[PDB]
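Homework-ish question, so no full write-ups if that breaks the rules, but can someone show me the predicted structure for this set?
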Amino acid sequence: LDELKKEVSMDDHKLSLDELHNKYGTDLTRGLTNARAKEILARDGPNSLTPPPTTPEWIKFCRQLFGGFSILLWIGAILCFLAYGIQAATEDEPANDNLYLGVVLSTVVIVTGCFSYYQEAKSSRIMDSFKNMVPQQALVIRDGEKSTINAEFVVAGDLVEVKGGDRIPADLRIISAHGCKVDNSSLTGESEPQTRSPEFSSENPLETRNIAFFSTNCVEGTARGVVVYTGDRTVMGRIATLASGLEVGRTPIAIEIEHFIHIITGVAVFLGVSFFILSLILGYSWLEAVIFLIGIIVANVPEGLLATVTVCLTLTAKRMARKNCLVKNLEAVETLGSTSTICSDKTGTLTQNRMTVAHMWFDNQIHEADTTENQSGAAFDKTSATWSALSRIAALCNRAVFQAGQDNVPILKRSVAGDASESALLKCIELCCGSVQGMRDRNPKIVEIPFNSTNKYQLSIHENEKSSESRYLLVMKGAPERILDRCSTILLNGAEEPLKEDMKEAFQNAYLELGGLGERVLGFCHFALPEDKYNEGYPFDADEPNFPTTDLCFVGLMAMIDPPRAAVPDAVGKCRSAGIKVIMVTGDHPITAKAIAKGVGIISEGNETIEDIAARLNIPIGQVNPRDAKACVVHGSDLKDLSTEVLDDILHYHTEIVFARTSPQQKLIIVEGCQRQGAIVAVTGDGVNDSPALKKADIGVAMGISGSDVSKQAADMILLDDNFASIVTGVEEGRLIFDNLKKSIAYTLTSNIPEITPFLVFIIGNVPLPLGTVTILCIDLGTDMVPAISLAYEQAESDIMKRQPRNPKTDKLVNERLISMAYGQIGMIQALGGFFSYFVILAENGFLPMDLIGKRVRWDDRWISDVEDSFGQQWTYEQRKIVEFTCHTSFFISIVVVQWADLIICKTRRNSIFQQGMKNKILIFGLFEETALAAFLSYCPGTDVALRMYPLKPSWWFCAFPYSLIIFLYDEMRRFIIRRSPGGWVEQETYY
Amino acid sequence: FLGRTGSSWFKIFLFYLIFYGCLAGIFIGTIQVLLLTLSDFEPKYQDRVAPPGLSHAPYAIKTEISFSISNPKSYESFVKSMHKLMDLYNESSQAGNSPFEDCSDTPADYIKRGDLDDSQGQKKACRFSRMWLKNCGYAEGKPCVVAKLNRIIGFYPKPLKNTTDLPEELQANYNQYVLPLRCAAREKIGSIEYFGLGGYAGFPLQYYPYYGKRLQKKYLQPLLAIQFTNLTQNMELRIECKVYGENIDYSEKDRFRGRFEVKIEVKS
Amino acid sequence: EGPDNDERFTYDYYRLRVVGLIVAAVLCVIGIIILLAGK
Ligand SMILES: *[C@@H]1O[C@H](CO)[C@@H](O[C@@H]2O[C@H](CO)[C@@H](O)[C@H](O)[C@H]2NC(C)=O)[C@H](O)[C@H]1NC(C)=O
Ligand SMILES: CC(C)CCC[C@@H](C)[C@H]1CC[C@H]2[C@@H]3CC=C4C[C@@H](O)CC[C@]4(C)[C@H]3CC[C@]12C
Ligand SMILES: *[C@@H]1O[C@H](CO)[C@@H](O)[C@H](O)[C@H]1NC(C)=O
Ligand SMILES: [K+]
Ligand SMILES: [K+]
Ligand SMILES: [Mg+2]
Ligand SMILES: [Tl+]
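A: Not a homework solution, just the prediction itself:
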């Protein structure tokens, strides 16, 4: 469906003005007829974007109500009402058991539904942001007259007019223009104004001057044009549809959840029906056969687990909110940890998005300035008298000014009225020479010649601030070579000197080096005009050369670039140390893209492209073995004629990849290419041209300050302070939460065994029921909750940023090793500790373990109010039941006591508690509150009716203590083996 | 295979065999020590049997014994359990001076055979003739229910003293040696008739305290036969038999705590 | 005692409940103290 939109567009900028009118039945001068425009409206439809059909929240909520655990809990809830119905008909049961348990279980499903619904959130308003880029109104020429109309009423063929400050209402063929410049950052991510004129200037319509696009704005001048595309058919309207239309897809974390749901659901249905038939064979009435099944359901399903996961995710997202990293989708909290490839935009993401002075060439020396936002570098020069001469030209031969009321904000961050290069120079001098306004007050400008297309230079004449002179100084800047052809002397370390071929060659060298760094280079020179030849009232003519512009003194060079953000180089290296592949994907030109790649460490030192090898060896590129080149730089124009299989080969064959001059669909294609190889991919960006890629990414991260509204709609995560170091933190947090989820899951599952085994022995042994159904829910929904959550606050056991990204095909959240430990080893020890306390309670009340076998028949018989114990005493029905429920209560408390040790062992997968310590305060809180809850549930009056919880005698609490301790020792010995031999036996069997 | 290789499948079996073996051996060990802390003659706790329960022979479907006089197999169900109990009180079961003793044919005081020790043989229990149960196949019309006080080791059932007012106000009040049992329903549409030891409507105190199964096997607890020769027919009659005493109490939950709940209906 | 051994069939479940609830409360307070050592 969207495969059409993933392709490069076709256009009609090649046609003549006249020819273009024939195609759209239009007038170049009079414009369309009121009737013809209305006709075309009904024909083509409105100049608007329609949002894609969404899935209502209704269906979204209910889709969770049927996912493995909820299905089993539904079967339980209904099976409760089943047994209740069968009762209400047969023998009038005045009880509330099956009825209430059926109500409780149905509530558990609904509430669990809210948790998973909260986790599976999708806040997407892509198409809405795009719609915000179409103006409310447009100016059209109809019947030879200009009028404002609803922009939706704009059709292909009419004559539109735009001017500085307004949004392009639709894709236009420029037919007339006067000084028109446009901001195409929507399509390129670059905000430098692009001229628009009627002349065709490139085969590529996205590069030609005679096309203006919807989603962009006119920055200055005026233009008229013929509408060629409207609504969904515009270049960026298609990007809108592509972006808004892209299928979301399941996250890595989501896939893991479903996976263990299958496992646990599997064992649940297995043991469920395996013992349902095992009971009927033993001659159990279907009346009972279902009651046992309900218990089996409740025992096997970890009722509180899915909600635990959600809370652990939420708590991890809260910590990241506190580092200026907003998470829109709870699952995106983990994806960053599983990320193996980052596709990053350059401008406004890796870079500050601001022309900044990078180097200066004066005194036959290359000086480097500090490009960082917060200025974390050092000085370059202050002493040289040459510097002050260059500094003066940079301030004086400059027409840029700071906007009013910025004195509060830092120099480099403040808004400037002017072109990017003049702003850069302004901020450079203001920083290291103080107020520039002061320099422009001490040296009043009397005449100037602003930068001309033809002159290729800008000159200014000022009254020298010096009192002993107060004469006229000439300054000029422009193209380095043009400035050179106008110089005779060079200000070396203070004093001038003739411009010999020697210094002239050093100039060329300096010029070539700076240009090689991808930096824009300017020349600077001045000339102190002779006093006798220029009186204090001498008039200077700016129109006609009234003053010399030759034999001037060359002062120096200055170079500039849109520099990396301070934290970016280091963040890139850190991603790469964690084994994450970092690719650059930018709408910017290749020379600039490549230079920043080396600056931030995308391309490491020494690595070459095929083009680099060819130039170094002075040989044809076809003569170069492409396998000798680990780095590559792909232009979008070449990308366009490559198949995906060939794109896949590029991705496979290079470690250091730069995709430059890419369109928005091309970014999507590169992302998909990476994913196709089985990689989890993150995208980082800030422009509307990142929207499709951000949507398709497993996780999209947008910049918060510099980011466009669209990009932040398309993302899963926002960096609110533009701190790229947050990606590094995000991946670290993502890995940590993945491990801690394992700990929390194992902990929760472990207590399933002591809830399952009592029901089994109840059938096979014919003893009184050791633990009840209600009692199970008091564990999974009550006591285990806070402890399970607390594992989310566990510190790393080792340097997680030192390991490679997990293999999502092999490294699962829940594997066989977890089940073996939780179900086969620790849970089994917990089961016994439960049974022990059960036998203790009964034996101390007169029913010794031996006489318990095959007694349930008489025990449950409501009409036998005289059962004989081991000592020959006789018990009524309600009397023995009180002891039985007291058994449920102590078995319950036994679970809590054995979960103490389990909580401590689940703390660490490898390390010892004596190494990791007990610095998790939430965990300790869990221990205290868990025990408080259990005690309250046993001793609070009335709980014997609502939950069948009975007061325990002090000695009862200590039954499971020896089992709780064996767990601690056992797991500590086991992990001691793991560490002592990384070999594999204990490791490959039990290492979560 | 599914998971691993044969070598791995073996090792995982050798482990869980030794592992579960140890766990079973430990579990058994903790059961040993538990038993080691307990007496053979007396349970550690008795507060959960404390107030004695009162149970009868007619096995009630739901605290009810409804049947038809004009039908044979209508009551043959209740006669099965009635027989089961009384069959134990046979004279052939009580033979010789061992381990039985002839005790007062009239309600007497308690009898202490020492302590709960094995320092003596089987503590000798008082004989009880089912022949003390006058009038009661059993009552084919108007049932002859048999009451019973639940056995509790070392329990001395103490009758109420005639200090103040009483339900069966002072009638045949053998204050010193009889634990009374008065059945009731207002709703007085019956005819209560009690049979027992010495002809009294109670339990003779000479059968106490019970020394337990280990120290007193073949021991016989006193019975109290109750006959309802009611002149009514074809209606559910809620009859409650209540025992009175210092150590006797009741509960709204446990409807068998020192009392009966019988729903007789001679639907004939 | 002899016939006056009523205490054998008695248990102070009332005190046990009072003590049990005291303990539960104090464990609840202690937990808050440790948690609130930083929030
Ligand atoms: C306990 O006493 C009952 C009294 O009914 C015995 O029942 C006797 O059963 C036999 C054989 O079935 C009959 O011939 C008699 O008529 C019954 N009564 C009597 C008085 O002998 C019963 O057998 C006795 N049980 C034991 C174990 O001795
Ligand atoms: C109540 C009692 C009788 C039930 C005992 C169940 C035992 C036999 C179960 C419980 C957990 C189980 C193990 C759980 C995990 C694994 C790892 C997997 O890669 C192979 C199977 C294996 C090794 C299972 C074998 C059987 C097992 C040990
Ligand atoms: C009980 O049986 C005796 C004979 O043993 C008889 O005289 C008497 O009438 C019976 N009593 C009743 C109330 O039927
Ligand atoms: K995404
Ligand atoms: K559980
Ligand atoms: Mg950008
Ligand atoms: Tl469970």
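Now go work out the reasoning yourself. Hint: The first helix of chain A runs from residue 17 to 24.
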